[PDB]
Design a protein around this nucleic acid. Structure first.
Length: 302
RNA sequence: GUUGGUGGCUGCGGGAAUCUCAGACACCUUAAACGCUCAUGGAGGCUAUGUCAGACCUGGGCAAUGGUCUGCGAAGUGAGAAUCACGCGACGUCGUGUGAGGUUCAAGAGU
């Protein structure tokens, strides 16, 4: 019943509270590159990297590392350790991107949920919009920068999600459609889920944005504006796709107890919402393909 | 140089659709296309079809035929505005601070 959910709330920090977010993202990237260089030159362990980070915080040259939140740097070091272990079971550096995130752990109520505000360790009260009601213990907050004027805080909480009631239909055969995104079928009626509106149009706008960026000189101010616009259109495409898939998968979970482009997001959302709401997933051409998928999935399940 | 009817390009409204509002518009019963302003800039920008190859393809090779915009100024470059209500400061505006923003549905995300 207790599920880990990420109440992504749009942050609206002031000038100081966003300067600090920038200086913490840069610091988490810096303490990543520095210790990656140290690890590469070594051929360090968790204790060694923690001690060297503490010395850097006390170092005169890099004293500003202690200004940013400590949990961001600790989790940056943890991510570096995991990446190094995966490469051993020497990854590339971290490049300054538009979309960069840091996460802060929870300790002695350093992070608190306000009405239209969010409390963060070095930031104070950060104004938020669309604060979905939270009734669980905060685990960590992934303060991020989608692009220049867009910040978010994936407040990971342990909120007890309740299982949904009994479902009207027993299965929903879904398969990748040619024209439609997918065709669902309870078994008799073929509800063809058409692709979300203005999806080819927004892909065309994405191509125009990519062409505009490639026409500009890197490191320029107008190049920065075009890069931000490309990031905005990427975020808009992600929002449209994820909203289409959220609505489709919630409709599938509510309407059907079983659910037999962006298909990766579709499958991820379907699986985690099936786990959350108490469902199961078994993992003429379109209609017959969907019917066969439904029949085989139901046979495998039972 | 037009009172009027439909359409969505951009900005805020957390997300999607829709809607107000605002910056521009576009056609005339049609439902498509497009963000805008100023300065600089000086010849290119967009698109359809063909190619495996400019969104270059995989040390080798291809970048063709048309339409469309464009010297009445393209790309690039620098600077700006784009919801509402209260104040504060300075000359009806400009900054600056705070607050609010409709309906339905939805909302785990990240290296």
């Amino acid at each position: 019943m207790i599920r880990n959910k990420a109440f992504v709330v749009r942050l609206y920090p002031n000038a100081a509270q966003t300067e600090l977010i920038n200086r913490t993202l840069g610091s988490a990237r810096f303490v990543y590159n520095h210790f990656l260089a140290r690890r590469i030159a070594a051929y360090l362990t968790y204790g060694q990297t923690s001690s060297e980070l503490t010395l850097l915080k006390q170092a005169e040259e890099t004293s500003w590392l202690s200004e940013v939140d400590k949990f961001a740097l600790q989790n940056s070091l943890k991510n570096l350790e995991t990446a190094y272990k995966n490469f051993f079971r020497f990854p590339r550096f971290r490049k300054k991107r538009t979309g960069e995130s840091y996460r802060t752990q929870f300790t002695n109520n350093n992070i608190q949920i306000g009405e239209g505000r969010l409390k963060l360790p070095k930031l104070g009260w950060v104004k938020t919009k669309g604060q979905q009601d939270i009734q669980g213990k905060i685990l960590n907050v992934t303060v991020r920068r989608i692009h220049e004027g867009h910040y978010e805080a994936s407040v990971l909480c342990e909120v007890e999600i309740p299982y949904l009631p009994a479902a009207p239909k027993f299965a929903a055969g879904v398969d990748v459609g040619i024209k439609d995104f997918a065709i669902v079928t309870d078994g008799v009626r073929f509800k063809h889920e058409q692709n979300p509106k203005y999806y080819r149009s927004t892909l065309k706008r994405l191509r125009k944005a990519q062409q505009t960026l490639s026409r500009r000189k890197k490191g320029s101010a107008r190049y920065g504006k075009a890069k931000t616009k490309l990031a905005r259109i990427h975020k808009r495409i992600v929002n449209k796709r994820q909203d289409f898939l959220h609505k489709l998968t919630t409709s599938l979970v509510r309407e059907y107890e079983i659910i037999g482009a962006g298909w990766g997001e579709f499958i991820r959302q379907l699986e985690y919402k099936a786990a959350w709401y108490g469902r199961l997933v078994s993992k003429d051409r379109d209609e017959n393909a969907a019917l066969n998928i439904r029949r085989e999935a139901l046979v495998a399940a039972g």
